Amino acid sequence: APFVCQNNCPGQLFVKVAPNLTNEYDPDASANMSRIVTYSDFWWKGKLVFKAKLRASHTWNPIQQMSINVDNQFNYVPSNIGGMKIVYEKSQLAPR
Amino acid sequence: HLVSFEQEIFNVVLKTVSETKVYNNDLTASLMVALDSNNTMPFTPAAMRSETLGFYPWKPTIPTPWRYYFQWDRTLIPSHTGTSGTPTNIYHGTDPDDVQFYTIENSVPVHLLRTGDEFATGTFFFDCKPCRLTHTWQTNRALG
Amino acid sequence: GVGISTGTFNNQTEFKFLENGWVEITANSSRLVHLNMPESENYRRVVVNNMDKTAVNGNMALDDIHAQIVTPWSLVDANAWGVWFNPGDWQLIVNTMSELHLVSFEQEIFNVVLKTVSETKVYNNDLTASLMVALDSNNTMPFTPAAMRSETLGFYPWKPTIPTPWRYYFQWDRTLIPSHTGTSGTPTNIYHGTDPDDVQFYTIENSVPVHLLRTGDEFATGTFFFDCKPCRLTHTWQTNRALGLPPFLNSLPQSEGATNFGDIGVQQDKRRGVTQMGNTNYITEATIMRPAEVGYSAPYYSFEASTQGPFKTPIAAGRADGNPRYAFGRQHGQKTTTTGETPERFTYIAHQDTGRYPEGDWIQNINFNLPVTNDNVLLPTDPIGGKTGINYTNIFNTYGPLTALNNVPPVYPNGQIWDKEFDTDLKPRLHVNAPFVCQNNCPGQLFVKVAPNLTNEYDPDASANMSRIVTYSDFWWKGKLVFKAKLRASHTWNPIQQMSINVDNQFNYVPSNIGGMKIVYEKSQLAPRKLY
Amino acid sequence: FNNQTEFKFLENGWVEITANSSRLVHLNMPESENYRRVVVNNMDKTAVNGNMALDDIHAQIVTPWSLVDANAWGVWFNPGDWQLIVNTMSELHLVSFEQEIFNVVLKTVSETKVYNNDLTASLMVALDSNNTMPFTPAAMRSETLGFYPWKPTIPTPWRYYFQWDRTLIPSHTGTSGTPTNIYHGTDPDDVQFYTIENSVPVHLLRTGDEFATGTFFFDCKPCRLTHTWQTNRALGLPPFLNSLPQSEGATNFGDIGVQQDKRRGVTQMGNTNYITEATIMRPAEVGYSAPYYSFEASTQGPFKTPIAAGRADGNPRYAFGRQHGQKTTTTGETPERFTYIAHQDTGRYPEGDWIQNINFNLPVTNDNVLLPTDPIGGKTGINYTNIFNTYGPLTALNNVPPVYPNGQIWDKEFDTDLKPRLHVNAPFVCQNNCPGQLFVKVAPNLTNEYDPDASANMSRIVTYSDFWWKGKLVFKAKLRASHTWNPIQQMSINVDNQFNYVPSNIGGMKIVYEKSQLAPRKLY
Amino acid sequence: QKTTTTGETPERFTYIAHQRYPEGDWIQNINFNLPVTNDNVLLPTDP
Amino acid sequence: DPDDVQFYTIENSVPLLRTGDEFATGTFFFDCKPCRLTHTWQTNRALG
């Protein structure tokens, strides 16, 4: 990663479904618990916040930059049957 | 820089399946949720197994089924193809004085969420140094 | 909780006759709106190519090629007069008002209900699941007025409504070279190209915030205020001959009968006056100067081509060869008990007399012989380019610094109310499609989508989309469009034209008690207005 | 001296660009102090039949002054800075402009040659803060101050058009005789002779003193660094596709559902039923067909009727020299040239234009349609799309992009009562008043041999000057945002274009055209 | 990966980050015989 | 290589003199750790 938390990081978030125990089960059984077929779905939301410094031009020459071109164009729009992709993108472009 | 982070889980629904299949709601049972707020459990991000939440907004996602990697004892002497015989390749179990067992239910508080309530991770903050999105070409030949 | 409804149905439109000759018209409206789930949640890029009907020569106008991003969301668009005012209201406003403004607009969704299908089909409420709703309050999405396809909400209060599935244009290249029946060349027609310069893929989920409603809570767009210019409910009759002072008459008709006429006494070259003919002495009403030109001629049935294919050049006014033609279905005014697929159709023959008559006009040489020889005059029947049916008026254009024009009239029920300004640096002077143009921003388009009601069958790896429980939603939309309008006046001695229920048209309004209703079109501009 | 550019940041995402530019400026004394009324001619070439387009006849007042003009982009921004301006920002406004001049030098030549110092004499300078002199922007002739800081540059000798009368009746190859091709002199009512000496007060400068302006403040409306891609066909709501595809691959097109004559919608023209994407009503018109390569005759001879946006025709072609961006190591006199194929889709494509008769019988027959293939006036080349004009009240246009480095920045609004809606040459047009031009001249080092009775030019010692110049030009601009899931186009250094931006072995340099309006914008 | 492809094969890539060359360097004897003799230099070619 | 290009000029980056006038810098201050003249006596043979 580019960042590492020195003291501590944000907490690890765990989720589990409480058992829908059937009436036939009781704890004296040796076998695994008999449950009703159950599933849960939920909506998640979060907000990372970054601080960033806008660059400034110090060379005379223009720097390399990330750009759509004729070749890579269709990577960034869906297909007929609803496909999507996310092609990788380089991340330390400007010459220091 | 990293500055702040938060989460919330909201608009929960729990459901059950009746056998064709028919789909029904649940309200008495709960979605169990726990936040390891002090990094007590072994720190194990999902990118190691490549199972973080999906990247497209307009699609459901699955959370990774969690496991943590235990203590164990094993030896393997190297060899290369064309060598005769078989190397010493044995598993020995565990060092019981280094073994540790972790469980959520005694390590972390649990919220029994239901179809009607939220859980909100508090606004965390970071101490991270500047990342710098630029690169250097100068080798040792190009110094001075 | 679930048990309590939240909002009240209301179509009761009311007239507040405020002070000093202005009336504030609160067009409340309400409908029941029915959504099915999307066909699939994935955004699809689709491209259409009717090579079949446009490989045949001479079918240049039939072209339908385009690309569009078929989108899971649906659009709830009220931008049509029929959604707001009933025929009694329109009778009133056209007969009694002169000028009209657009003040403010509001929306709220309430009483949302969501249902799923279980085995014949048996239907139940899913009290836990959700409807997604999203307002583009900043107009980040491209403006897509549904009236141009007759896809607004339905114009009847009592009958339910279905909202249009949303889609928007995505850039394409095409050249279609024209050809006639009997051209050998088999012209170039190539369906392909998207430039990287121009790609714009917009998604609701990223571009705007979204609310996840449940059966029990409401969404309300706050009061958005328009800024627009006035619209005139009155029409101008003076084409250029009827402007200014008429000539003086020396011999008035002595009889009462219309078969006799009055005479100018002074011979045509002895007359006084001002002219725009530097080398000719005759003064005649076809030649006397006038302050400026009313109306403008334009090349009629001109198609022109830019990067995205050929298109019809719009014209600001008509004399039918320029007046708009409308087409619409059961939900928008066709007699609802009719079988069959053919949309009802009308052409709005506007009363605005500032049109042109391309069989009436000619050009003649600067020497200006009065009895023109054939070589010194270009009649509208003469060929151009050797073609027999094409004449000079098809190429002609008189638009100038001098040409005055009226705005497009309202048209009831199928016409638009508002449109958005083009984001060009140089703005056009009028819009052919709507009377009012939002200068700053238009009201946010409102989008809706049944929240995915997943089965237990979803995974990261499945190539197929998620296995959806078949789910549908019905919600009660309510809108409040507030107009402001001045009352008419009575300058003339003799009464203006007014809308009325003449005995023949009567049973186009009162319900054909077999079950049907219709909504016949009404002229919007009735009274005359003096131009100069 | 300064040539740094500073990007100060303001509240809410505006940015202020303080562009500094400085130069070492060289000026020889005039050939003569005589104002000259020169009539200029190419009589034989324009009198050969068919050569009307090359008609150069004009009259001008040659002046004993030079013009210091900073009115082009390359004076102020370098390729590195222009990248950041183009690719991060959506809108741009001019704020303010000032000049100042410093470290004047003044010398004479004597006889190898000895280059004397002449601290006694003076350099002559005139700031036209009163906007008296007719505006004569050097960008159109590629004569601005040079687009590099380091090497010196020369200010161009100044001149302005006099009035003239000319007629040139056109004729084709093989027409009989020579058509009426005459210069009729000038009308007395139109005459305008100006002199700097009675238009502007003149400062005298020496080695040891300096000059500075006040800050001109601009009133201009925004230029946009983004382009509109939608034409008429892409406005509004697409038709609903009843039969969506079932496979990937471009061969699997989608099919709009119900037949042509039975679809719903609105059409502007209505004697026939068909609602199609060509015929569906759209809110307005983007662009317009201008009559292409129309030349019109004035009192002062023929001229090209300009066009608002191009599709090559109508797109601007710049010709420029070594001081303004041609590779300075080159020898010879052929100027470098580029045609700026602008990004805007506001143009028009004449080969797809067609007209058809009112009746609209659907598969059209030859006698009821007019095509670009078809003659007008018997001329087998010229077709109706040349004489066509569809400027109308519904036409909408986008002001001209910036052209870097040769393009002009600001330009003056014409004094006419009815003013044009856009200018062809400059993105910004200044309404109330415009930057005062700056003129420079060298005072005569008269010989002792001068007297007023001699009718030849005044005898002078060979004199020349150089001086350092410093302009400061301030812009305000707005930063863009990620309105869309895809990345936009951007300017970049790549394997092919890298050597354009870095010097040669001899240390010469070049500057290459950078497409400005580079990000897409939602039109409707 | 393309959401609509079938199959179990993952998509792979490597980050050629903008920023050693083992084939291009050597270790030699301290005495520094400039036209170096075989025994006095160790090269990447050498087993 | 195109990513690596860094062309610089004094005139475009950095902010005149004659006989009888002068130039001066601002006064700089360092924050370096001190240099020391001590001799470490432990060697490959001598340790502890």
From Swiss-Prot, chain B:
Subcellular location as annotated: Virion; Host nucleus
Annotated Mg(2+) binding sites: 38
Subunit structure: Interacts with host TFRC.
Role played: Capsid protein self-assembles to form an icosahedral capsid with a T=1 symmetry, about 22 nm in diameter, and consisting of 60 copies of two size variants of the capsid proteins, VP1 and VP2, which differ by the presence of an N-terminal extension in the minor protein VP1. The capsid encapsulates the genomic ssDNA. Capsid proteins are responsible for the attachment to host cell receptor TFRC. This attachment induces virion internalization predominantly through clathrin-endocytosis.
Additional remarks: The capsids of autonomous parvoviruses expose a proportion of VP2 N-terminus and part of that sequence can be cleaved of to form VP3.
Family (UniProt): Belongs to the parvoviridae capsid protein family.
Comment field on protein domains: The N-terminus of VP1 is sequestered within the mature capsid. It contains a phospholipase A2-like region and nuclear localization signals that might be exposed by capsid modifications during virus entry.
Name by which UniProt lists this protein: Capsid protein VP1
Annotated organism of origin: Canine parvovirus type 2 (isolate Dog/United States/CPV-b/1978)
From-to range in the entire protein, with total length: 280 to 429 of 727
